[PDB]
Amino acid sequence: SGWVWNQFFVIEEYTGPDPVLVGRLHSDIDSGDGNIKYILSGEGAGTIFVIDDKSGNIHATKTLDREERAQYTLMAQAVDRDTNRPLEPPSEFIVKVQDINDNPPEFLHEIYHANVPERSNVGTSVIQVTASDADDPTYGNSAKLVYSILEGQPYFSVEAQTGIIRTALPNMDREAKEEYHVVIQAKDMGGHMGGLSGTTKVTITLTD
């Protein structure tokens, strides 16, 4: 009451040999004597999700890819094994496939072409670069991307989250170098120990 408890979570991409227990239907009249038969209709019910009608345990029959389906709405019933009358009214619940970090961040193009005026002030922006990341930006952080500059410093910087590359050095007269070659990295998981990553190269002209 007040609190909401009717949803179940399932770790995606499970490939162990024994089926994942998603959750259980269960009624408060159930003395667990066995006179009660639970019934499960709805999405994947019977196919992906399968219930033991005494215990009321639902189990996942398949490896699930949360990239394919995040949710399933299912319907619980419970009828009296003898009278066959219902013992609870039928109610919905949702199983939600928990995201796992199984996709590495990927850059929109993996060669950007930028240009910026010769004597620009330190801080002047050059180009926005962004990585899409196929995991769940909603729930996890297998989708929280951090941008680092790998090659191209001390000439240029990149904004930690925005992924914008700005000049980072004063009096950058053009004679100096013909065209600058930078490499930006994008990392999962707010870039922590573990996070999957991907890079790109930006090639910058200093305009006159």
Q: Which does 161 bind (CB under 5 to 8 A by kind): its own copies, Ca ion, none?
A: none
Assign residue 47 a region (left: φ > 0; alpha: ψ between -120 and 50; beta: otherwise): alpha
Min dist. Cβ of residue 126 to its own copies (A): 35
Nearer of residues 101 and 197 to its own copies, judged by Cβ = 101
What distance in Å separates the CA atoms of residue 113 and residue 161, rounded to the nearest whole number?
Answer: 20
What Å distances lie between residue 136 and 21, 46, 67, 119, 147, CA to CA? 22, 27, 8, 42, 18
Cα atoms found within 13 Å of the Cα of residue 206, Cβ hemisphere only: 22
Q: 17: which residues sit within 8 A by CB, 6+ positions away?
A: none
Q: Which does 188 bind (CB under 5 to 8 A by kind): Ca ion, its own copies, none?
A: Ca ion
Nearer of residues 24 and 151 to its own copies, judged by Cβ = 24
- Which listed range, 9-17, 125-133, 151-159, 174-182, lies at the site for its own copies (CB under 8 A)? 9-17
Q: Is residue 17 reached through a cis peptide bond, with omega within 30 degrees of 0 on the bond before it? A: no
Query: E strands, 118-176, where?
Result: 125-128, 131-132, 146-151, 156-158, 164-167
Q: Is 17 in the site for its own copies (CB under 8 A)?
A: yes
- Are 187 and 197 in contact, with CB atoms under 8 Å apart? yes
Q: Is 135 in the site for Ca ion (CB under 5 A)?
A: yes
Interface with its own copies (CB under 8 A), residue from 2, 31, 111, 208: 2
Min dist. Cβ of residue 14 to Ca ion (A): 11
Q: Which does 93 bind (CB under 5 to 8 A by kind): its own copies, Ca ion, none?
A: its own copies
Q: Is 89 in the site for its own copies (CB under 8 A)?
A: yes
Of 124, 129, 156, 130, the residue nearest 143 (C-alpha): 130
- Contacts with its own copies in 23-62 (CB under 8 A)? 23-29, 55, 57
Q: Is 21 in the site for Ca ion (CB under 5 A)?
A: no
What distance in Å separates the CA atoms of residue 133 and residue 199, rounded to the nearest whole number?
Answer: 12
| Contacts with Ca ion, residue ranges (CB under 5 A) | 65-67, 99-103, 133, 135, 142, 188
Binding site for its own copies (CB under 8 A): 2-9, 11, 14, 16-18, 20-29, 55, 57, 76, 78, 87-89, 91, 93, 98, 100-101, 139-140, 142, 194
